[PDB]
């Protein structure tokens, strides 16, 4: 059985992986493939002579995107580095994201998911995932003969803590 997360033990190798057909061509004598880390990745099916590739079963980190408990209890979950089939589901390069609504409007980053996607709590309130906004766009009216001279000042005291 192929293309399925199956516990496998071939010729007594053992392990867990996804069995798929391999385009790689064994030399006739060879039996077991291996990796740079010296772990089994290619096997020859014993009974019938087909070359099987071992791809380890899918996995990834589990990260949650959660707003303040007092503001609400709603939560959206990030399954890290898995495509959105194994699992308001949004697919980003970071991984599959469940429980969040995509919006094309952009705001300043509040909760960062990675690959440019930041989350924040806004409209009635919910969790939204959007391409993060870099700041307000401001083209300057540059010209060969135009100068801007400030006519006023503000003395702002800023706190820096070390």
């Amino acid at each position: 059985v192929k293309n399925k997360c199956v516990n496998f033990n071939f010729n007594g190798l053992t392990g867990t992986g996804v069995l798929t057909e391999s385009n790689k061509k064994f030399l006739p004598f060879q039996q077991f493939g291996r990796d740079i880390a010296d772990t089994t990745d290619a096997v020859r099916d014993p009974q019938t002579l087909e070359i099987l590739d071992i791809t380890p079963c899918s996995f990834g980190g589990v990260s949650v995107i959660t707003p303040g408990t007092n503001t609400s209890n709603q939560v959206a979950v990030l399954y890290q580095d898995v495509n959105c089939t194994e699992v308001n589901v949004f697919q980003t390069r970071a991984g599959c994201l469940i429980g969040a609504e995509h919006v094309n409007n952009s705001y300043e980053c509040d909760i960062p998911i990675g690959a440019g996607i930041c989350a924040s709590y806004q409209t009635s309130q919910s969790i939204i995932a959007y391409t993060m906004s870099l700041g307000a766009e401001n083209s300057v009216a540059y010209s060969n003969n135009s100068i801007a001279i400030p006519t006023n000042f503000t003395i702002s005291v800023t706190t820096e803590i070390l």
Partner: protein, 226 residues
Amino acid sequence: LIANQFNSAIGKIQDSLSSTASALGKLQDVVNQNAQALNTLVKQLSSNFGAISSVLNDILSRLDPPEAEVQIDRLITGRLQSLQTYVTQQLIRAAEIRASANLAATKMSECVLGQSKRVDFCGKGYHLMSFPQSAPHGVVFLHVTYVPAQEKNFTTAPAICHDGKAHFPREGVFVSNGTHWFVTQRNFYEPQIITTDNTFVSGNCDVVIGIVNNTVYDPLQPELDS
């Protein structure tokens, strides 16, 4: 206006610290990280490390040395490795603190003790002065900075020709509000009429690109005319 604006800025410092606790994140992170490190150290103390029982007095009482020595050796190796991990974590964190401490020492000397012309080393904007305040296992800086506020449109030109001789500014910029030509300081709009005391003469018109035609007034001339 400066006195009241600075007092108000101190007032906003008062309100920002009194109301918002997000500012003290770095020191709170240092304290929490260190306390959590010690707490983790004690938790590793009260962990079995692959022996019969975590308590040394227990393993002592129940087993005598000839067999017990392997279990005690296991507890020693586990604790000593945990202490190694803890010390190396503390020692490296001490090094990062030392880097921050030296950065603070430099920032103290170069910013508090004296005005620093370095940009954004002492908070955003041109720096005027900074003040130290003590804090638990840290220092808090107030950075008094000058920030330009309101723009104004002027036409401009690199230099000025008066008699075919090109005049450049000693300090400031040639700015025209559309019908007359003034010289202004770079970071604040204080227009002044063009005179020979603010400008030094050099060369001729042809070489400099973008020059405009503008009369240059000579303060000495009305004094000799009168």
